[PDB]
Write an enzyme that holds these catalytic residues in place. Structure first.
Site, PDB file in Angstrom:
ATOM      1  N   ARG A   5     -89.326  21.361 -64.225  1.00 12.21           N
ATOM      2  CA  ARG A   5     -90.814  21.069 -64.444  1.00 12.21           C
ATOM      3  C   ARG A   5     -92.019  20.995 -63.310  1.00 12.21           C
ATOM      4  O   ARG A   5     -91.371  22.425 -62.284  1.00 12.21           O
ATOM      5  CB  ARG A   5     -90.793  19.169 -64.497  1.00 12.21           C
ATOM      6  CG  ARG A   5     -90.328  18.837 -65.013  1.00 12.21           C
ATOM      7  CD  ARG A   5     -90.180  16.906 -64.390  1.00 12.21           C
ATOM      8  NE  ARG A   5     -89.239  16.151 -65.191  1.00 12.21           N
ATOM      9  CZ  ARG A   5     -87.849  16.359 -65.351  1.00 12.21           C
ATOM     10  NH1 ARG A   5     -87.117  16.592 -64.469  1.00 12.21           N
ATOM     11  NH2 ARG A   5     -87.308  15.061 -65.695  1.00 12.21           N
ATOM     12  N   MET A  35     -80.944  31.380 -69.919  1.00 13.48           N
ATOM     13  CA  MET A  35     -80.126  31.354 -69.004  1.00 13.48           C
ATOM     14  C   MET A  35     -79.072  30.762 -68.610  1.00 13.48           C
ATOM     15  O   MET A  35     -79.559  29.440 -67.350  1.00 13.48           O
ATOM     16  CB  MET A  35     -80.891  32.155 -67.507  1.00 13.48           C
ATOM     17  CG  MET A  35     -82.447  33.021 -68.212  1.00 13.48           C
ATOM     18  SD  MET A  35     -81.476  34.674 -69.533  1.00 13.48           S
ATOM     19  CE  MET A  35     -80.159  34.895 -67.519  1.00 13.48           C
ATOM     20  N   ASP A  72     -96.071  37.660 -59.553  1.00 11.71           N
ATOM     21  CA  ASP A  72     -95.068  36.353 -58.841  1.00 11.71           C
ATOM     22  C   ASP A  72     -93.506  36.514 -58.860  1.00 11.71           C
ATOM     23  O   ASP A  72     -92.734  36.154 -59.307  1.00 11.71           O
ATOM     24  CB  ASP A  72     -95.307  35.367 -60.343  1.00 11.71           C
ATOM     25  CG  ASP A  72     -95.693  34.206 -59.813  1.00 11.71           C
ATOM     26  OD1 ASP A  72     -96.347  33.614 -59.012  1.00 11.71           O
ATOM     27  OD2 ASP A  72     -95.333  33.266 -60.850  1.00 11.71           O
TER      28      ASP A  72
END
Lengths: 87, 304
Positions: free
Chosen positions: B25, B94, B144
């Site tokens: 989230r 994954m 990132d």
């Protein structure tokens, strides 16, 4: 709807300069300010209430609270606008 | 061609996006676990309902990036979905989630991430980056690099994951002017101050990621600690390394199950990678050689 990365970038640079103009307008200490912004953006050092308002006055909302991934932020844009003005 | 999924296909794969299926989230939206018609496991990223420009720039970037980078250490976008009301991206599942998900933010009583498994992550993820910088034309700056964007498969092999913030750079350029984007604490000082990024911002981000990997904590957690001594994070870590107060840094959850020399060498890579001077900062391919065995002690000597 293709998004324009340049426009987005231009707007941030512009909102930042308009914001910097105001801070210079309000006699804010700027070589002072570099420090609060640098220490906040690197070390996530909590922003002074002193200046939080000053920024809030200029419309720049303190503060980068999230550890989430930023596509952009007013504070980062501003920090760049500062260093341009002061070498 | 990149597979375009229907919203319904993904609805069904996800059980209409049941909370039972959520893997992650954030403000960006949510990530659901899924199973396709053919029993293929996937992770579906449903963007938030608000159509802001940040998400949109990221969505288009991840989609365009699909055919520009292929490598076993990069997560590959398997597909997208685009209804008026919906933006979704689909990835290979994954099994072992994000590195960050295994690092003390790990839920309940999940087994600690073993040390040798952390060294494997450092290596694999370094290969992915080296690739983005050296063997793509144009160069790709990920922008990132952090624990949250390193995914682990069922063999705990590392996969660098999110290309929303990626930046193409001419192979010949030393820098490219772009907005400052990224995660606070993983953005390089020169990039922060000038808005001019390069592959070396990725190296810096990687260096911090390693601190997450060694510490077991987010870059944010670390910052607070450095401050307590009223010192900058990097001078703090460097100081602990030099005074052998390493016990203070290492992921307590590792208990003690690690060779003190291994961890230190990894911290050294970290510090070399986070030097304020971009030109002194090693290339990501040098980091890969370093982690493999060659060249560390020398480069660390040239440090002092």
């Amino acid at each position: 709807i293709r998004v324009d990365r340049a426009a987005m970038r231009n707007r941030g640079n512009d909102e930042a300069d308009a914001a910097l103009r105001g801070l210079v307008q309000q006699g804010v200490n700027l070589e002072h300010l570099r420090t609060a912004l640098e220490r906040h953006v690197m070390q996530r050092l909590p922003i002074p209430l002193d200046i939080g308002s000053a920024l809030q006055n200029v419309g720049i909302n303190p503060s980068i609270d999230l550890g989430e991934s930023l596509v952009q932020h007013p504070l980062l844009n501003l920090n760049v606008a500062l260093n341009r003005m002061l070498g | 061609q990149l597979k375009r999924f229907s919203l319904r296909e993904l609805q069904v794969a996800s059980d209409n996006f049941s909370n039972k299926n959520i893997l992650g989230r954030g403000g960006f939206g949510k990530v659901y676990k899924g199973r396709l018609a053919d029993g293929t496991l996937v992770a579906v990223k449903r963007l938030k309902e608000e159509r802001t420009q940040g998400g949109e720039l990221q969505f288009q970037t991840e989609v365009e990036m699909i055919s520009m980078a292929v490598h076993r250490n990069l997560l590959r976008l398997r597909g997208f979905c685009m209804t008026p009301t919906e933006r979704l991206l689909v990835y290979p599942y994954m099994a072992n989630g994000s590195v960050a998900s295994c690092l003390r933010e790990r839920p309940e009583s999940q087994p600690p991430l073993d040390w040798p498994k952390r060294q494997r992550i450092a290596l694999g993820s370094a290969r992915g980056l080296a690739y983005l910088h050296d063997h793509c034309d144009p160069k790709i700056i990920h922008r990132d690099v952090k624990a949250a964007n390193i995914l682990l498969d069922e063999e705990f092999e590392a996969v660098v994951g999110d290309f929303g913030l990626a930046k193409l750079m001419d192979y010949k350029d030393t820098h490219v002017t772009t907005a400052v984007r990224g995660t606070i604490g993983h953005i390089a000082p020169e990039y922060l101050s000038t808005g001019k990024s390069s592959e070396k911002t990725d190296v810096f981000g990687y260096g911090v990621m390693l601190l997450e990997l060694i510490t077991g904590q987010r870059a944010f957690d670390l910052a607070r600690l450095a401050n307590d001594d009223d010192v900058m994070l990097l001078d703090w870590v460097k100081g602990l390394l030099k005074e052998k107060k390493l016990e203070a840094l290492v992921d307590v959850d590792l208990q003690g199950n690690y060779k003190d020399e291994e961890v230190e060498q990894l911290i050294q890579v970290a510090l070399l990678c986070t030097q304020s001077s971009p030109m002194e900062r090693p290339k990501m391919s040098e980091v890969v050689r370093m982690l493999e065995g060659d060249g560390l002690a020398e480069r660390w000597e040239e440090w002092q």
